[PDB]
Symmetry: D2
Subunit: 498 residues, 4 copies
């Protein structure tokens, strides 16, 4: 279990990190990145606080105490403990402003370690070499959980439509592989130690494009190309209460003939393996993302009750009625999380997996409606979000006291009530805040794909059990049985169109 | 455990029943009512079928085997058995076309028998008489569960705004009470044996208007004034597959100086008792209604998959996408039911009550959206629901075979595919079917009131725990603590407006 | 200008009319059909009422006075007179309960007579015969406007996917053509004199399936196969105020070797002619349908204000707020109609055509939202639409006066207020009424196709003018100009993927 | 007609301007304000460009050529010219990024000069002084149109609930009045020459709080307290194409014993005058705001077609279908503007006023839906709006060319396609852009008030003409006539509740 300071020092390691185009020599001290790095350092210190040992840690099999971000659940009760762990962090991060602490990221490994042998059995290797990919996965899992390494996944590929820009193998040899190209998008890249590189199957994916591998962030040839930082380390925290903490950067990564030793490769070369195994990995991101959805909706409804109360509008029945739908928004997200847990079941390896049907459709409920919930919260604000005094306006020796007189409420000071506006403006009306909404839109399986995937499930086919009730009501057999009676009506008849 | 024939005979009892204005001398043989009465007779026979003993019956404490419509649940597992019981009936009734079999109606008593003493303690009696209302409730519960009586609630009052038309006590004496006035609305009235009369508190309710009592349907002075029947006993069942079964009538009831003996009175005269106890009774109607919502959404999505497949439109991506939202509609209802059960807890009397927060908001999710789900299913039909051949058209010696040629599908006959249209038309485009949609709209706490009630709950007050997360993010105390700091800013200052 | 009685007599003509499978010997006297036939008879008498001469008639070129259902508009002011004509009829029919009086149906001819020569020039004829199709159209138009014939279109085909069941030519000779097969759907078929047969292009349509022709309803071999009637000639009009008037039947038509003389053929045999000319005909149905949409929304909002006022709920702010959106629904429909008229322009033949962009998208606004407007109106009703006394209940000597006491409002009697419920139930909760909603859904270009058609218009292409503003903001050329700069960046560079 | 340079110099005038708390000594040179000031300078130069004389100017009555922002329309054709004038500016400002150039602001005066005498007749003056308020208005209008002064309205008051913080008269004398307090919100304050101070009636408004007056921005005692600037004068315009132009600041204004001479007062002291006259002034802001709505929706749909085409998603039918609804969104806004113009009518003074019913409800259509249109456009972007390379990333000597390879499209370069993302991010995902969306939400009569106002109109009362159609269908008199028949049913009867 690492300390914050050990975490911070692990980042000072030669990594090539671009932020808005600017090379960052030291992510732990640069103004664009240091607030977030410090926030993850604090994340690590808290795991060592005895007061939080129950929620944040577990004593594993060999008696060692490890952080719950390494905990594989074996039961419904274990899953519920992981839920409270995720909830701890979403609340600690003020509703979930940072979505990818290690607790959100390391979950992508749980399905690999649970069932490593297919990763090797399906694997695709040149020159008759024999690589022990399942051993590799088991070795990596023991290394990262023993050294408390921080890992971030990079699975999404650039949408190229004869060497593509996508990451691909350009050489295989006795020591390992060389890869060249881009990974399209990952999160917290400058703030972890190693990447979990992978693929989700897309049409046309070749063997040389199928690579799953652990690769350190400071490996020769790897460049992190991150979005500009929206952190405001020097702003007054009354004016910007959240961007002054830091910014969880997102970015791409370019691999300039990166060498990967075989011990770090988990699978190469089988596109079909990309078709079902990485989705079992992201089921676990979806689970924790779906829990965070409920917390965010909780923060929205609470802001809304405090805000409407502060403005004396909470007794308007239209307002009362919209608050009630915000409450329902929150409880819908919560209900899907409970349903997913309660109808979960154990994998062959013994991993208790929440039901992803309820996870994915709970996420769809959030994805479809969150921008309406946010729009409703903003609507409650009125003008305050077009203009609200800064702390400097309130501090002006003459105009300041007059602001505090003119903007106070019945039972709330001007500074406190404006601080409600500025909290809502930070999250939903700034570049800093808009990234949070965009990340939740586009990271994970997005709404349009949840829809398509849903309809490919076995449970929801025309012949699946979901049409049993309607077949009974209509007096039908299955598809094949209806088709048979149509054919005999044609066969038993005199028609010009058959 | 009564037989169907004993049930049917119990109805031939002198009751005064008006259906569309027509006096019905025998509800078991009249064409307007006999289909439904026969459907409840079958409901009773099935409880005696050994094949369904596990789901439909229980062996109670004294070793007697009784129908589950008398089963008080003591645990989460008991609640789950009641759920499967309700589900049995919604599926047997083809998705829930009849909403108030005895299994749906008798649940209003579970909270009375669980906690009868307040009904007497709060009670409101004249002339220094002493009535053992809690004994009365315990006696009634033993009578109705031993004789398998069929009961329907009448709680809703006419919305009068110096003797009102609402039911009220006009005399109290040693034998019992005399009541006079209307009950506004009940269901299955001509098809039960006794009414469960009651009140939900409204502003202005007087003592003499607060009456809770068992009263037999054939009591002197009681008139059932029911809506016209939409049953079609003589239609061809291919043309009208559901109205040919029967019609679950709804109606009002007028009490022309009805005498009620004290042994049948459960509480009189305390308006405040109407404020919280009857809502604990209807929590149990809401529970089963909320389960039925999921079944109905299951029937809708199944009809939609069969229908779009029958029309060759199921591969259009827009259609695929709308089917997926119908699937999600169904799973949202299901998830709220599971969440309500799992977060349930036991009353002081030992009754395991599902969490009504999830029940009520699951109902709100249905109530807000069902007419969009139905509208989507209808949209999938196209023209078929403006005109589709009757069975007589298909049977015409010359035009019939031509209809079967012109309207067949790839892998489905004309008759079978048109039978999909006519199933959807029955439920959603007829008087017979529209009653089902209207009943689900308006019976139970309707959407606008679920909203208002929600916001009166303790969990959702400005100072409740739902604003804890947002208070933490803002750095606030509770309402009283914010008010205090506002006051000192005023107090510590120089303003012209204070 | 025919009389009602001449109209009624024109229907007693040997026609083969099936209604719910039942052969109707005389549509003017049979209970299933006579109410509607009488309603169209009254439609004709009113054109002769001097009081309505201004709105209902015009004095054409040769000095003859004709009904406006034959009026070709030549100007924006003429179009506005046609609008008031359509509005007269939608208001006379109580908001539009019958959608296809002759005024709604004959409009499909306006674009043919305006531009007849392409109908012949494109035409497709066998055996080197020469048919004067444009002469035929001009002759037909003079016949039908001089004899005041009633015409209904049949354009929709059965969706067959080696002689198909669709109508097609099976012989061509010196006298005319023989056709065999179905037309899928028309309206008012038993109540007009001749059909306007036609096609809208679908993929796979053959030459022998492309037929445009006037054919009398009593032609040998033609069978009208209509939906069951929902008319209730014997119901009490207080209980059913609209189905007691009659039912505008919809149906199919089978052609059993129907002979059509050349003088009645307008075009045969060119599928491509079906691709753009019939849509110019239905532009005129869309125009009047779009005006009716506004009237229907007017009737809905008026019912809603009267109803909420009758229930004392009109001052609830939530109700006030929903009434306001119903008002906006009505004014949106109206605004699209005004915009279509004002931006109209004249055809080459001199016909002033309202802008169909605003017509079609005004229709889309109605089609997307009407079932929400109706659902809101129903929600305002409460329980009254589950049960409301019939006139017989109110007339009962003992219970009747008690109903009138219990159901009266502050300032409105029980009978009058229940008559609001029963008006809403007729239109939106019965088989009779549901047909109106279904007809408006599915007749005309439906919403999903309005969407697709919209995006095929020239105005809305990627290179059309609708992207001019955004091209200017981005600093782009047209598609071809952007493509050119992409190519040179590739060409001027060193890449592995080009 | 002023030049840009005369405009810029008029601003260097001693004004007290706070921007984010910082005193701005010269708004024409400070980085926070100079971009916008220069944009209005260009606005003025363009009026003098002969090429734009037709659209931008008019030759008034005395032969003088003036800018159209002073043009009072006298006809439907004049109104259409003003529409094209507003449209010119919304397109010049890239869809309307700046909402309050002088053309948007000076319109608040048109209704005063049209009908000045009530402003004096209603006026409320102390000490028996006689002030010629109508003369004052006529004098001011001649001064501002002759000197081309720039004016911004300040009408909104702080929501104080014994001297309030709201602006109010604290002295009246022979020279004029002294006012003290806040105005709550105005736009472009640092960039105009004089304020148009006024009030909209709120409950409790006193006589001393009713002040309408022209007051120069550099008057002794006036402080402009503006929101922080989101301008980015030093950013690369490829990264931020709109915030590099400037920022139209919004703010409050404090009056520290400001003296106003009588010649600048237009009305004081009659709260009732605030009830209907200022709404006639803002009708003209609403008109131009409503036109801008259509332009913005045009820019959104154009961005969306270019974007989906650039991503190869424009042929997905779901996408095609959502583009079509964006097109409809644009045409709905346009249709309401056309309807408002065409049904306009002339005031008593001769001013042709577009119909505000269609203006306000067209605005409501925008206000209710714009955040869904924006959310749809963002959804089309995918990941590109979480991260897209800056110009520095693209310029990197090694990673740059690789970015251009990996992010290019079929027929569009990487730089051009990313420039689509960054245009959408500027407008809808930054502080700079969010102000535009917030201004359109909250400035003007907002949606919830449009609803309430709508229902107070005469046209939409229970007894108004909108219920005529439904009264006819039901067979009712007016409210008074129904009430009469209810009373006689009570009177002619035997009831216990009357």
């Amino acid at each position: 279990m690492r300390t914050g300071q050990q975490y911070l020092e692990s980042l000072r390691d030669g990594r090539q990190v671009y932020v808005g185009g600017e090379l960052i020599d030291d992510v732990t001290t640069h103004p664009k990145t240091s607030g977030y790095a410090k926030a993850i350092a604090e994340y690590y210190d808290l795991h060592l606080d005895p007061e939080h040992q129950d929620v944040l840690t577990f004593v594993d099999d060999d008696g060692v105490r490890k952080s719950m971000h390494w905990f594989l659940p074996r039961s419904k009760a274990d899953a519920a403990r992981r839920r409270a762990y995720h909830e701890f962090w979403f609340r600690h991060f003020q509703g979930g402003i940072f979505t990818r602490p290690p607790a959100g990221m390391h979950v992508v490994m749980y399905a690999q370690i649970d069932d490593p042998e297919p990763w090797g059995d399906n694997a695709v290797v040149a020159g008759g070499r024999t690589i022990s990919f399942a051993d590799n996965i088991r070795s990596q899992w023991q290394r990262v959980t023993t050294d408390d390494v921080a890992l971030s996944p990079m699975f999404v590929d650039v949408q190229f439509d004869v060497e593509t820009p996508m990451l691909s193998i350009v050489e295989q040899n006795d020591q390992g592989i060389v890869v060249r190209g881009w990974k399209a998008m990952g999160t917290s890249l400058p703030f972890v130690n190693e990447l979990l590189v992978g693929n989700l199957w897309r049409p046309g994916q070749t063997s040389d494009q199928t690579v799953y591998a652990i690769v350190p962030v400071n490996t020769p040839g790897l460049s992190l190309v991150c979005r500009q930082s929206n952190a405001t380390p020097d702003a007054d925290p009354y004016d910007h209460p959240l961007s002054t903490i830091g910014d969880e950067l997102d970015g791409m990564a370019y691999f300039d003939d990166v060498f990967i030793p075989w011990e770090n490769v988990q699978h190469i070369g089988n596109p079909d393996h990309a078709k079902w195994y990485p989705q079992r990995q992201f089921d676990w991101v979806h689970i924790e993302t779906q829990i965070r959805h409920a917390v965010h909706a909780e923060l929205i409804v609470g802001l809304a009750l405090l805000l409407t109360n502060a403005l004396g509008t909470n007794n308007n029945p239209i307002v009362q009625s919209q608050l009630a739908d915000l409450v329902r928004f929150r409880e819908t997200c919560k209900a899907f999380a409970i349903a997913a847990e309660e109808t979960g079941f154990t994998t062959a390896g013994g991993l208790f997996k929440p039901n992803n049907i309820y996870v994915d459709l709970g996420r769809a409920h959030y994805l479809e409606n969150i921008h309406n919930a946010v729009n409703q919260l903003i609507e409650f604000c009125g003008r305050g979000v077009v203009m609200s005094p800064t702390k400097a306006d309130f501090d002006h020796p003459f105009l300041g006291p007059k602001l505090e007189e003119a903007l106070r409420g019945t039972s709330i000071s001007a500074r406190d009530r404006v601080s409600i506006f500025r909290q809502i403006s930070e999250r939903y009306l700034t570049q800093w805040g808009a990234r949070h909404e965009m990340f939740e839109k586009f990271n994970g399986t997005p709404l349009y794909l949840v829809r398509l995937l849903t309809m490919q499930r076995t449970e929801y086919q025309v012949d699946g059990p979901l049409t049993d009730l309607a077949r009974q009501v209509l007096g039908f057999g299955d598809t094949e049985a209806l088709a048979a009676r149509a054919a005999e009506v044609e066969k038993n008849s005199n028609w010009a169109s058959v």
